[PDB]
Amino acid sequence: VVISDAWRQRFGGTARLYGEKALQLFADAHICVVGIGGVGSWAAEALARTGIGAITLIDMDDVCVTNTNRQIHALRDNVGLAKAEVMAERIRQINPECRVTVVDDFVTPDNVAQYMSVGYSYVIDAIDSVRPKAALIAYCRRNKIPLVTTGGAGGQIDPTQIQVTDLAKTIQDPLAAKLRERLKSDFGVVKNSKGKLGVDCVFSTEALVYPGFGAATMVTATFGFVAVSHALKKMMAKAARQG
Amino acid sequence: SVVISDAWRQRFGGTARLYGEKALQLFADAHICVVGIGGVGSWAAEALARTGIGAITLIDMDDVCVTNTNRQIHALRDNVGLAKAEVMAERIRQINPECRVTVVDDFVTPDNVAQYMSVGYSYVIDAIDSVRPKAALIAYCRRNKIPLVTTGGAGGQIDPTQIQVTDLAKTIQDPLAAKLRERLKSDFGVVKNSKGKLGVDCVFSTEALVYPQSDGFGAATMVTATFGFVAVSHALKKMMAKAARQG
Ligand SMILES: Nc1ncnc2c1ncn2[C@@H]1O[C@H](COP(=O)(O)OP(=O)(O)OP(=O)(O)O)[C@@H](O)[C@H]1O
Ligand SMILES: Nc1ncnc2c1ncn2[C@@H]1O[C@H](COP(=O)(O)OP(=O)(O)OP(=O)(O)O)[C@@H](O)[C@H]1O
Ligand SMILES: [K+]
Ligand SMILES: [K+]
Ligand code: NA
Numbered sequence: 001v002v003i004s005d006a007w008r009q010r011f012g013g014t015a016r017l018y019g020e021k022a023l024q025l026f027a028d029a030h031i032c033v034v035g036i037g038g039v040g041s042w043a044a045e046a047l048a049r050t051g052i053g054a055i056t057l058i059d060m061d062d063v064c065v066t067n068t069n070r071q072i073h074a075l076r077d078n079v080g081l082a083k084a085e086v087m088a089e090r091i092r093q094i095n096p097e098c099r100v101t102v103v104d105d106f107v108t109p110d111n112v113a114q115y116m117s118v119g120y121s122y123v124i125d126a127i128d129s130v131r132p133k134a135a136l137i138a139y140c141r142r143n144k145i146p147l148v149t150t151g152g153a154g155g156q157i158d159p160t161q162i163q164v165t166d167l168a169k170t171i172q173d174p175l176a177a178k179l180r181e182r183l184k185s186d187f188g189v190v191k192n193s194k195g196k197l198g199v200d201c202v203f204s205t206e207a208l209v210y211p212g213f214g215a216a217t218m219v220t221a222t223f224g225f226v227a228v229s230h231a232l233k234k235m236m237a238k239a240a241r242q243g
Numbered sequence: 244s245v246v247i248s249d250a251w252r253q254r255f256g257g258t259a260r261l262y263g264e265k266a267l268q269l270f271a272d273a274h275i276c277v278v279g280i281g282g283v284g285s286w287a288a289e290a291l292a293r294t295g296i297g298a299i300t301l302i303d304m305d306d307v308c309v310t311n312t313n314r315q316i317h318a319l320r321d322n323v324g325l326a327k328a329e330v331m332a333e334r335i336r337q338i339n340p341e342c343r344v345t346v347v348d349d350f351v352t353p354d355n356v357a358q359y360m361s362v363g364y365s366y367v368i369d370a371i372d373s374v375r376p377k378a379a380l381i382a383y384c385r386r387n388k389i390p391l392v393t394t395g396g397a398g399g400q401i402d403p404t405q406i407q408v409t410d411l412a413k414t415i416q417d418p419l420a421a422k423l424r425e426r427l428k429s430d431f432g433v434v435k436n437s438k439g440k441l442g443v444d445c446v447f448s449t450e451a452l453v454y455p456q457s458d459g460f461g462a463a464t465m466v467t468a469t470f471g472f473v474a475v476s477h478a479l480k481k482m483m484a485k486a487a488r489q490g
Binding site for chain 1: 250253254255256257258259260261262289290293294295309310312313314316318319320321334337338339340398399401402403404406407408453455456457458459460461462463464465466468469472473475476480
């Protein structure tokens with residue numbers, strides 16, 4: 001992608017933070033966000049606001065009033081529209097030059113290859129249900145597709161306990177635990193000699209608050225923001241190693 | 244006092260399930276002021292609206308600029324040139340049409356701070372980036388025991404997991420916080436106490452600053468928004484703790 005003057009105006013602050021090479025790297029990147037909800041809608045926003053030049057959004061759910069407490073697209077006039085389309089329209093308002101694709105579908109074990117094989121720079125997995133989540137992680141891991149997944153973000157109030165570690169090492173996260181169990185039984189994914197699954201997971205050390213679970217923007221959005229920052233760090237590091 | 248509607252419970256049922264029923268009403272009855280609707284404050288304002296805060300005041304007189312796009316939730320193609328506080332207020336009304344939103348189209352000064360703080364806020368979130376008015380706001384809220392959380396510099400930082408809350412005296416790697424301490428002392432007589440604390444809660448990051456990489460500091464949504472989100476979570480926790488302690 002050739003960066004226009006308007007793009008340099010919008011993302012001058014990105015360039016001043018990450019550098020010119022990173023700005024170009026981001027403009028040339030294509031990142032996929034799967035699940036445009038409490039975590040993924042903010043991830044998508046952050047990607048757009050950091051000069052990522054191409055974004056794919058995968059979700060088939062609509063905006064509901066009950067999303068209001070934790071999803072950036074949940075506004076009165078958006079209720080009943082497709083989440084992914086509302087977020088795509090917002091991204092075009094953030095960066096009119098971003099290449100935005102909507103996949104109006106849910107990821108399944110049956111279709112993940114079709115969806116994941118377009119060649120993404122990174123995949124951010126913000127799915128809440130274990131079966132498709134395991135199928136997505138297993139596929140990206142096998143195919144060496146850069147992935148960051150997110151554990152359970154509900155039932156938590158403290159954004160400062162969010163961190164990234166190998167999926168094998170998460171604690172206080174029942175979703176991540178169920179995911180490990182399904183990866184093992186259904187996909188043969190098991191931890192290596194060093195006790196790692198080779199899957200990066202955003203999780204929180206906070207113990208869950210039972211009232212399903214409630215949620216707050218301040219936590220669920222930070223899950224998405226930490227996923228994006230982690231992906232960009234890994235992308236920049238890889239680019240720095242080439243040469 | 245706000246009567247919580249059935250629509251409010253649809254919007255904020257997840258808030259009640261997380262913080263509790265008493266908290267839902269506490270939030271609906273609260274009036275929180277966000278000073279500075281920029282890289283930090285615009286996301287704080289968003290988070291307050293989405294957590295069922297019943298009245299929000301926004302204080303800023305700046306306009307949306309295309310260069311805000313990297314880090315401010317209101318920075319959209321069609322908002323460029325409009326007043327930030329008014330754009331953000333209209334958004335809050337779309338989030339919660341029953342939220343009482345007040346716009347103060349002004350900057351805080353030593354001359355006007357008492358008037359603007361005279362409404363009796365449940366909490367003040369200080370997201371000012373300029374030291375002069377920041378010091379005046381902090382000194383006033385501190386003297387008057389007005390609940391306040393301030394934010395250091397969120398620019399020049401890339402790692403959201405290093406953001407935390409501490410006493411303003413103990414921040415590191417934050418030149419804005421450093422200048423602010425100096426102005427508080429020289430202009431307002433605010434100095435640290437026996438325990439070395441200023442008695443002001445400050446959001447900062449332990450991350451070392453990243454200096455400008457092209458042609459001041461750069462910034463990213465993932466960090467500046469998390470400053471605002473950590474500030475809101477801290478304020479809501481302190482409000483809940485105070486309500487529980489009355490009893
Ligand atoms: N298999 C899948 N592929 C892609 N997206 C998915 C899949 N399964 C779920 N999603 C989406 O992931 C998102 C998760 O959002 P989140 O957990 O914040 O709450 P929600 O599902 O919108 O609300 P609620 O939990 O009350 O139904 C949702 O938008 C959902 O539609
Ligand atoms: N005295 C004040 N009273 C109220 N709001 C203020 C005051 N001083 C500054 N602010 C606001 O704090 C916000 C800070 O935003 P941030 O530092 O992320 O970038 P910015 O200042 O918007 O960028 P730029 O300086 O390039 O326009 C601004 O919107 C500014 O108007
Ligand atoms: K947890
Ligand atoms: K710092
Ligand atoms: Na942290």
